[PDB]
Each structure stands twice: as structure tokens, then as C-alpha cells.
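TA notes, week 10

Several of you asked for a full example with nothing omitted. So below is the full record: C-alpha cells for the whole chain, then the designed sequence directly under it. When grading your own attempts, check the secondary structure regions first.
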């Protein structure tokens, strides 16, 4: 009945969030996943959207405590040349993606002269013609406006948490309202916006509710949750979370809270097997799919130690077929834009 109630317009209360978020039993969790699939199937059927991830520069000037690419970490870093971007684009044409996500750290090269980023968006839009999600960090409003004019469609700029006590330990040195304000500015210029929270990073149930309610206030087009994977060389490298607040539970709660929105199943956390679990918890778009071949990186990189990664669209679509799901039509995706 819970899925039916939501389909009809029921708004989950804070008591409902507490109850859903504290579910621990196999049967309870299966009833929560089933409810979220009812809601997702009502609005999306068995059709799934596919987003390619192009991490085009792994340089960052910021010092996030959770992220492998924080500026204090002495690691391998790359910055794709124009020729490498064009070669990557050639491998994506006609592959079946609905959108491409052009992501970078806050790379000083692109921040010193943001016309270099605007030209990168123009080249990719000219090559692919597809909807483009940008994840450039907190770029200034003038650059956001120029990138919109070159064909950027989505801005992904995740808040991580709306619990202020936690945000300042995670996004060290970054304004809390700066990110909120940039998503608002981008919506005014016509972008769709994705917000996101991290779980497994010391958020308890109350912190998670504050973050779910914080995400809803701004009317995002896409909402996500990622499991924190502690990374080598960061301040949080040893962190162990003592919580039941799994990404799958929160995906189902997001579907019940944002029934009509996009919610990702990311390959970056648990790969294709993890994708199955996330789609069965209510997700409707598969992200962190890499270009065919590709030495390109994800962000959490659950598969950093594997001799062979399984991140390509053809493996994703094969697994959706096994699940009884199918890629969506492009026009259905464009309807969200
Ligand atoms: C793809 S965005 C990068 C864009 C730009 N640098 C930024 O911070 O907005 C990185 C996000 O990846 C996720 N992330 C980073 N490190 C992670 C980790 N160790 N585990 C899980 N998610 C992580 C976070 O939600 C952070 O918002
Ligand atoms: C975190 C990344 C996305 C950033 N906008 C990508 N690895 C993902 O999981 O979708
Ligand atoms: S999350 Fe984004 S801003 Fe923070 S260190 Fe990682 S790449 Fe840089």
C-alpha cells in the first residue's frame, strides 16, 4: 500500500522517514524496495536512462576530507588534451547514451581562464549533440551562464549533507550557501540540477533526515545518494561507519519522496552487480558508465584494485535485459530537460 499511497500524492512525514530509515530486517527491507519499485514503475515503467561519465581532469584545488583527489593527496593526476577528448567522443557516438557527464576536480587550469571550460563544453556538444551534464565544482555564475549557451543541460553540484556540523568537516573551506546559490542560479539560466548526499560518512538517522529535507527545498531534477568509500591518503582513510544507513534504503526513500525524479544507480560504488541492487531499490538512471575501453577514472573507484573493470554500456544493457529492463527512448529523457 505504501507505493500506492505515494503514487496518489502521499507525502512522507518525519516519523515515516525515521521508521523507513531504521529498517533492519530482510523482510522489511524487501517491502521498502518493492514499494519504491512500484512508484518507479508507475512513472518510468521498465525503462532506464544511461549516463556516460567523462572525468576529463583529475586536478583539484579543494581539500575535501573524503575525496581521493583532494589537493593534499600526492597522486597520479591527468588532464585530457583536446585530441583525447575528441577521440573519447568518437567512441560514444551512437552508443546508446542519453546524456554525458563532463566532470573535473576544481582544476586551476580551467579556473584560471574559464573560457577554456566553456570551449570544452562547446566542442563536446558539437561532437555529440547529446544532453550534457557538467560537474565542474563551484564555477562562477558567469561561467555557468556561458556554458548553458554552449549546450550544457544539467549541473551536478552535490551538497553531500545539509547538516552544517558535518558539512564543514567534509567540504573543508567551502561555503555551504555557495553551492546552494550556484544551483539556484543555474536553474534560473535553464539548467536542470542534480543534488546529492553521502551516506556512511558519520551521518546518523537525524542527519540524514536533515539532508533529505534540505535536498527537497530546492526542487532538484535529479537526487542521489552515494555510499562513502574511504580512500587512501585522505583524512578519512581509516573511517568505519557504525550505521545501518545503507545507500539502498536511502534510494528507496528518495523514490518515495521524489517519485517523478531521476535517481541514479552508480557503477562507481559496487559496479554492475551493485547497479542491479540500486535499480531494484528504485533508481532509474545508470551512471558512472565509462566510454568503451577508457583508462578514464571514476571518483570513488570501487574497482581500483581489479585487473579488469566492467564499466561499459554494452555490459550494462546486457544486465538490464536479464533484469527485464530496457533503455528509455531519447524523447522521454529530453522531456525532463
Ligand atoms: C563527481 S563530484 C566532483 C565535482 C567537483 N569536483 C565537485 O566536488 O562538485 C564528487 C562527488 O563525488 C562523490 N565522492 C567523492 N569522493 C567519494 C568517496 N570517497 N566515496 C563516495 N563518493 C565520493 C561526492 O558526492 C562528491 O560530490
Ligand atoms: C560521482 C560521479 C558523478 C559526478 N557528477 C560518477 N562517478 C557517478 O557516480 O555518477
Ligand atoms: S569532491 Fe570535487 S572539490 Fe572535493 S576534492 Fe574531490 S574533486 Fe575536489
Amino acid at each position: 500500500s505504501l507505493g500506492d499511497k505515494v503514487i496518489e500524492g502521499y507525502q512522507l512525514t518525519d516519523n515515516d522517514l525515521r521508521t523507513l530509515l531504521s529498517l533492519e530486517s530482510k523482510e522489511g527491507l524487501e517491502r521498502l524496495y518493492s514499494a519504491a519499485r512500484k512508484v518507479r514503475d508507475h512513472y518510468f515503467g521498465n525503462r532506464v536512462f544511461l549516463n556516460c561519465f567523462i572525468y576529463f581532469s583529475t586536478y583539484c584545488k579543494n581539500q575535501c576530507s573524503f575525496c581521493y583527489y583532494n589537493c593534499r593527496n600526492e597522486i597520479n593526476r591527468y588532464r585530457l588534451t583536446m585530441e583525447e577528448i575528441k577521440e573519447t567522443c568518437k567512441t560514444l557516438k551512437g552508443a546508446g547514451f542519453h546524456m554525458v557527464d563532463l566532470t573535473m576536480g576544481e582544476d586551476p587550469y580551467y579556473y584560471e581562464d574559464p573560457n577554456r571550460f566553456v570551449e570544452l563544453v562547446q566542442i563536446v556538444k558539437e561532437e555529440l549533440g547529446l544532453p550534457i551534464m557538467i560537474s565542474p565544482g563551484l564555477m562562477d555564475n558567469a561561467t555557468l551562464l556561458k556554458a548553458r549557451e554552449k549546450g550544457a543541460n544539467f549541473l551536478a553540484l552535490y551538497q553531500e549533507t545539509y547538516d552544517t556540523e558535518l558539512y564543514r568537516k567534509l567540504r573543508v573551506g567551502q561555503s555551504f550557501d555557495g553551492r546552494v546559490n550556484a544551483r539556484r542560479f543555474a536553474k534560473q539560466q535553464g539548467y536542470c540540477v542534480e543534488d546529492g548526499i553521502l551516506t556512511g560518512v558519520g551521518n546518523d538517522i537525524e542527519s540524514t533526515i536533515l539532508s533529505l529535507r534540505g535536498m527537497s527545498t530546492n526542487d532538484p531534477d535529479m537526487v542521489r545518494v552515494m555510499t562513502f568509500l574511504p580512500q587512501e591518503g585522505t583524512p578519512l582513510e581509516g573511517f568505519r561507519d557504525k550505521s545501518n544507513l545503507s545507500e539502498l534504503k536511502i534510494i528507496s526513500v528518495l523514490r518515495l519522496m521524489f517519485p517523478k525524479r531521476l535517481i541514479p544507480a552508480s557503477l562507481d560504488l559496487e559496479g554492475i552487480d551493485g547497479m542491479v541492487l540500486r535499480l531494484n531499490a528504485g533508481a532509474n538512471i545508470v551512471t558512472s558508465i565509462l566510454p568503451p575501453d577508457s583508462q578514464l577514472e571514476g571518483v570513488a573507484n570501487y574497482d581500483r584494485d581489479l585487473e579488469e573493470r566492467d564499466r561499459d554500456i554494452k555490459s550494462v544493457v546486457r544486465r538490464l535485459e536479464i533484469m527485464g529492463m530496457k533503455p528509455a527512448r531519447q524523447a522521454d529523457f529530453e522531456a525532463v530537460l
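The chain has 14 helices and nine strands. Use that as a sanity check on your answer.
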